[PDB]
Design an enzyme around this catalytic site. Structure first.
Site, PDB file in Angstrom:
ATOM      1  N   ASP A   1      19.359  -7.684 -51.509  1.00  0.00           N
ATOM      2  CA  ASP A   1      20.353  -6.890 -50.777  1.00  0.00           C
ATOM      3  C   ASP A   1      20.018  -6.813 -49.253  1.00  0.00           C
ATOM      4  O   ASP A   1      19.897  -7.867 -48.640  1.00  0.00           O
ATOM      5  CB  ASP A   1      20.495  -5.515 -51.484  1.00  0.00           C
ATOM      6  CG  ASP A   1      21.556  -4.636 -50.902  1.00  0.00           C
ATOM      7  OD1 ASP A   1      22.740  -4.885 -51.185  1.00  0.00           O
ATOM      8  OD2 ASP A   1      21.206  -3.727 -50.122  1.00  0.00           O
TER       9      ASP A   1
ATOM     10  N   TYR B   1      23.090   0.072 -41.434  1.00  0.00           N
ATOM     11  CA  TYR B   1      24.502  -0.334 -41.246  1.00  0.00           C
ATOM     12  C   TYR B   1      25.038  -0.056 -39.854  1.00  0.00           C
ATOM     13  O   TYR B   1      26.145  -0.501 -39.536  1.00  0.00           O
ATOM     14  CB  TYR B   1      25.414   0.464 -42.209  1.00  0.00           C
ATOM     15  CG  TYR B   1      25.250   0.123 -43.669  1.00  0.00           C
ATOM     16  CD1 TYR B   1      24.327   0.797 -44.461  1.00  0.00           C
ATOM     17  CD2 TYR B   1      26.044  -0.845 -44.272  1.00  0.00           C
ATOM     18  CE1 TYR B   1      24.189   0.508 -45.812  1.00  0.00           C
ATOM     19  CE2 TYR B   1      25.924  -1.135 -45.632  1.00  0.00           C
ATOM     20  CZ  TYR B   1      24.989  -0.460 -46.395  1.00  0.00           C
ATOM     21  OH  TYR B   1      24.831  -0.742 -47.728  1.00  0.00           O
TER      22      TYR B   1
ATOM     23  N   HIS C   1      24.753  -6.240 -59.495  1.00  0.00           N
ATOM     24  CA  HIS C   1      24.108  -6.104 -58.190  1.00  0.00           C
ATOM     25  C   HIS C   1      22.617  -5.797 -58.240  1.00  0.00           C
ATOM     26  O   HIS C   1      21.865  -6.272 -57.385  1.00  0.00           O
ATOM     27  CB  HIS C   1      24.808  -5.042 -57.346  1.00  0.00           C
ATOM     28  CG  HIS C   1      24.195  -4.878 -55.988  1.00  0.00           C
ATOM     29  ND1 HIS C   1      24.318  -5.860 -55.018  1.00  0.00           N
ATOM     30  CD2 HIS C   1      23.424  -3.876 -55.502  1.00  0.00           C
ATOM     31  CE1 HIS C   1      23.632  -5.417 -53.980  1.00  0.00           C
ATOM     32  NE2 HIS C   1      23.086  -4.223 -54.222  1.00  0.00           N
TER      33      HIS C   1
HETATM   34  O1  6N8 Z   1      25.982  -3.023 -48.154  1.00  0.00           O
HETATM   35  C1  6N8 Z   1      25.151  -3.814 -48.574  1.00  0.00           C
HETATM   36  N1  6N8 Z   1      24.502  -3.653 -49.770  1.00  0.00           N
HETATM   37  C2  6N8 Z   1      24.683  -2.504 -50.614  1.00  0.00           C
HETATM   38  C3  6N8 Z   1      25.563  -2.904 -51.778  1.00  0.00           C
HETATM   39  C4  6N8 Z   1      25.557  -1.895 -52.910  1.00  0.00           C
HETATM   40  C5  6N8 Z   1      25.979  -0.532 -52.453  1.00  0.00           C
HETATM   41  C6  6N8 Z   1      27.252  -0.288 -51.961  1.00  0.00           C
HETATM   42  C7  6N8 Z   1      27.618   0.982 -51.570  1.00  0.00           C
HETATM   43  C8  6N8 Z   1      26.709   2.011 -51.673  1.00  0.00           C
HETATM   44  C9  6N8 Z   1      25.442   1.771 -52.163  1.00  0.00           C
HETATM   45  C10 6N8 Z   1      25.075   0.507 -52.560  1.00  0.00           C
HETATM   46  C11 6N8 Z   1      26.302  -2.347 -54.144  1.00  0.00           C
HETATM   47  C12 6N8 Z   1      26.385  -1.489 -55.223  1.00  0.00           C
HETATM   48  C13 6N8 Z   1      27.057  -1.835 -56.376  1.00  0.00           C
HETATM   49  C14 6N8 Z   1      27.665  -3.069 -56.463  1.00  0.00           C
HETATM   50  C15 6N8 Z   1      27.595  -3.950 -55.399  1.00  0.00           C
HETATM   51  C16 6N8 Z   1      26.924  -3.582 -54.248  1.00  0.00           C
HETATM   52  N2  6N8 Z   1      24.748  -4.934 -47.867  1.00  0.00           N
HETATM   53  C17 6N8 Z   1      25.270  -5.244 -46.560  1.00  0.00           C
HETATM   54  C18 6N8 Z   1      24.536  -6.475 -46.099  1.00  0.00           C
HETATM   55  C19 6N8 Z   1      23.535  -6.830 -47.176  1.00  0.00           C
HETATM   56  C20 6N8 Z   1      23.676  -5.798 -48.267  1.00  0.00           C
END
Ligand code: 6N8
Ligand code: 6N8
EC number: 3.3.2.10
Lengths: 534, 534
Positions: free
Chosen positions: A322, A453, A511
């Site tokens: 990630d 972010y 994920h």
């Molecule tokens: O936002 C990113 N990763 C978190 C994804 C995660 C998440 C999204 C939103 C909140 C927390 C965690 C996720 C969770 C579940 C499925 C897919 C993805 N990235 C941006 C650049 C590299 C990674």
């Protein structure tokens, strides 16, 4: 009523038995039957072998005494080969693990020696892997007593703090079972593993044979070596460390922990690597300064280089997942001399678009809406910090357990708006594992993690300096079939930047790759490490 | 008035210069003069080499572009050899160290590349050793600017936070000195080292040439990776960790610290070893339980085995001094499979006398009177804890600085009775180093450390179990000519127990071996490690 299980080592937890090599040698060298096995037992309780097994003398001292007994070709060579050939009896260990998992106290009780051979490390490694799965390891050479002496059995019971009838004892030597039987312990003569295990599941009432593939060994936080490096005045980095060999630096994603690698740490260390599982900046025991700028990729990467500098490491293989995967590609682009090899789980390498703002690029993909919600300082912190148990339970779930919609998060005004207050516990995690993440996030919250972010423009300008470069160091891209945000197709163009890129792909994987598919992650990483990272 | 010193890398801090290899190759291959050196500079500021040095492309991308320029035999091979041959210019580094020691800000300013060659580690190791001795390292490929562009010079001054007239700048390329000269910086064209250093000492007014041999690099506690392992519920062990390679576990004596190895830690890590400098049980950041039994050798050794278990180490080479040396011999006797090699400074291996109480054995030697004074719980603690600065200043001194009489300590009723309240600072230590020990002993005091002496009978009974054994793993005994308690002659009978024992001997060396004679300790240990510990 059984509550403790005891296992012998030679011919029980480890196979082939070292005892059955003297006979193997006789047959191969066409020597008179039992000649070598008789020399081995010459003098019985007064003999050289009993002195060895009681710890009076070492293996190197015993070798010439055995040779004198044999002269009623090398004894050393025969034993070096026998010890090297002897490996863990995986189904026996699996049974011991299942018994301990069900509440049984487990122990290895073994007649062994003080090994001072030049090649003693092989056995040292075997005892290490084995012993950590048991409550006790009782060695004859340390306790000064040997099986079948009745004193070692009374010592076993005192160590177990259990009455004999509560103990099942497994051994391949019938004479060594007799005293345990006489005391009233349930005994199992072990010839072939399958039969011994049928006997074991019959007496315990626990399924031990034909059971599903267990998960890899995990980590108990309190049993790890915890390390701390100050990278600059207000910033220290925490890591968990296990094993010896080439350094492998593990970098978690958002909103995670070093613990997200719990299934990989013991496996990679066992594979011959020195694992350094990070708490990335903003997380767990690592520092979480409040400034947004403290979390741009340039500073994060510079601190990871300082981390290596302070530990005295010229290189480390960098493996990320990630946001950690995003960091490892930048480590490879900006500090290739410090990256032995680079691997990413889910996160593709996507070069910066110099003709489009990163804000525009994120707006183009509907799945990335949550990222715009994360921009305003304090808004996402409030929602994610409101109820930590709810945050982790809602986030950490398999592809088929989704309770979250990551589309129109802004429009709905929250990541968890039409999500339950009390989510059901995912099959990937236990309540205790969720509570570990809860306790970790109580220290610094979500400010530092969300700041990762908040540096889009800063990261975009820095990444543009690398647009003329290629990644030419060893590299691995691992895709997860069911990650609906970091989709496998997003990685399709990577070999234009990384021509020699190697790949791995995990089917029916969401994920949370490391905990969703631990066995396959470990198989892919170990295979790649041994072939490409030395 | 000078306050900052800047050095180039190629041809200044590292020799032979990589630039002078293109000419060397031409001469060896009888190629037209300057052919290769011209290909190297083809296109000037627009050329492939400028793009490389600015970080636009990596070394592996530049290699084929150089080959195309050469065709106006392998460029890779020529550069691989040139980089491998290039080593630190030790007298130049010595001068930079002396300048920084005198209060100067120091920096390396270099035109370098992003190295992604299969053999990039060699250079990575060199930059690592070099950079840690300087306040800043400015690399062209990271800053996107190159010498002789005037912007890199303005960047240097802003980084140094110094006016040009306060800066001396050393470079082997005349064109690269010109912009620094134009700004008003003192400049030195470096051809041969001796001349450059004469020029340097003339402008600074600091002796830099012909100065005495400096001490090895020491440790700044705040810059180390600090590790913590819980070995049992109430006991955690602290250690300092540096380097990669085979694990080397350093065990201090009484009343010491991990810091007692400050001169060895950087040297052994630099030599290719993974150093783990312990705070032994009862000391510094390690736990100090009050019970006497917690400090018998059997428990101390068992915890050191658990320490290895938790870190995932099957073995470590064990090096001890004083009480640490006593522990390492028992580690070798009771856990040879876990000890890769064993080394002791001052402490001989003396087997237990089974026909005499250890109390009787200690009474036989007048130098060991202080040990009987140490028996009664609370008496020695009171005296040693009364004034910590006085304790360490009185204890830590060279053979010719003695303020203590260790004879008739009991009769005189104290270790420091006819000793000064304000001892003079020994030449072996600084006030700051004494204050480090003071601050460490404020946590737990002297109870745990003195408890190491309170298990004579317990240690005697355990040691007697090893009377039939021999130490047959690699072993080193280092004697100190002037240690008047752990005398060299006490080790005279060791080869009866350790037939293959190797030795080292340090003349004009007192008890505090590591700090008394750091350079020779390091020379003896590194030599032995490379020959016997892999
Ligand atoms: O936002 C990113 N990763 C978190 C994804 C995660 C998440 C999204 C939103 C909140 C927390 C965690 C996720 C969770 C579940 C499925 C897919 C993805 N990235 C941006 C650049 C590299 C990674
Ligand atoms: O007492 C032991 N070492 C401390 C010696 C030290 C000392 C003695 C008394 C107090 C503190 C430190 C010393 C200091 C100066 C010169 C020689 C020796 N040992 C007993 C078995 C192995 C070591």
């Amino acid at each position: 009523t059984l509550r403790a299980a005891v296992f012998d080592l030679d011919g029980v937890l480890a196979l082939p038995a070292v005892f059955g090599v003297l006979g193997r040698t006789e047959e191969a060298l066409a020597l008179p039957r039992g000649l070598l096995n008789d020399a081995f037992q010459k003098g019985g309780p007064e003999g050289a072998t009993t002195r060895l097994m009681k710890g009076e003398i070492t293996l190197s001292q015993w070798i010439p005494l055995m040779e004198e007994n044999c002269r009623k070709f090398s004894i050393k060579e025969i034993f070096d080969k026998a010890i090297s050939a002897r490996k863990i009896n995986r189904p026996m260990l699996q049974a011991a693990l299942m018994l301990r998992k069900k509440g049984f106290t487990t122990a290895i009780l073994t007649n062994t020696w003080l090994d001072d051979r030049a090649e003693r490390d092989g056995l040292a490694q075997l005892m290490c892997e084995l012993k950590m799965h048991f409550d006790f390891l009782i060695e004859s050479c340390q306790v000064g007593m040997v099986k079948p002496e009745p004193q070692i059995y009374k010592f076993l019971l005192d160590t177990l703090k259990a009455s004999p009838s509560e103990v099942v004892f497994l051994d391949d030597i019938g004479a060594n079972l007799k005293p345990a039987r006489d005391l009233g312990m349930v005994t199992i003569l072990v010839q072939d593993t399958d039969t011994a295990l049928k006997e074991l599941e019959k007496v315990t009432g626990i399924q031990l044979l034909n059971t599903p593939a267990p998960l890899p060994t995990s980590c108990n936080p309190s049993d790890m070596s915890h390390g701390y490096v100050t990278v600059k005045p207000r910033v220290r980095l925490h890591f968990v460390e296990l094993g010896s060999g080439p350094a492998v630096c593990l970098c978690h994603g958002f909103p995670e922990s070093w613990y997200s690698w719990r299934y990989q740490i013991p496996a990679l260390a066992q594979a011959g690597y020195r694992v350094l599982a990070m708490d990335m900046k903003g997380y767990g025991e690592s520092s979480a300064p409040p400034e947004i700028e403290e979390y741009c990729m340039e500073v994060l990467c510079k601190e990871m280089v300082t981390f290596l500098d302070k530990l005295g490491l010229s290189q480390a293989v960098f493996i990320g997942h990630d946001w950690g995967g995003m960091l490892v590609w930048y480590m490879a682009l900006f500090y290739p001399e410090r990256v032995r090899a680079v691997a990413s789980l889910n996160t593709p390498f996507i070069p910066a678009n110099p003709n489009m703002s990163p804000l525009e690029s994120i707006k183009a993909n509907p799945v990335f809406d949550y990222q715009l919600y994360f921009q305003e300082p304090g808004v996402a912190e409030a929602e994610l910090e409101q109820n930590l148990s709810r945050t982790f339970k809602s986030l950490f779930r398999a592809s088929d357990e989704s309770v979250l919609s990551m589309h129109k998060v802004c429009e709905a005004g929250g990541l968890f708006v039409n999500s339950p207050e009390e989510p059901s516990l995912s099959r990937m995690v236990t309540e205790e594992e969720i509570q570990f993440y809860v306790q970790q996030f109580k220290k610094s919250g979500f400010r530092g993690p969300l700041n990762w972010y908040r540096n889009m423009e800063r990261n975009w300008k820095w990444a543009c300096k690398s647009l003329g470069r290629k990644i030419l160091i060893p590299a691995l891209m691992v895709t997860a079939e069911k990650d609906f945000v970091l989709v496998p197709q997003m990685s399709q163009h990577m070999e234009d930047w990384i021509p020699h890129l190697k790949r791995g792909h995990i089917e029916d994987c969401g994920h949370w790759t490391q905990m969703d598919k631990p066995t396959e992650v470990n198989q892919i990483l170990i295979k790649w490490l041994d072939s490409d990272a030395r």
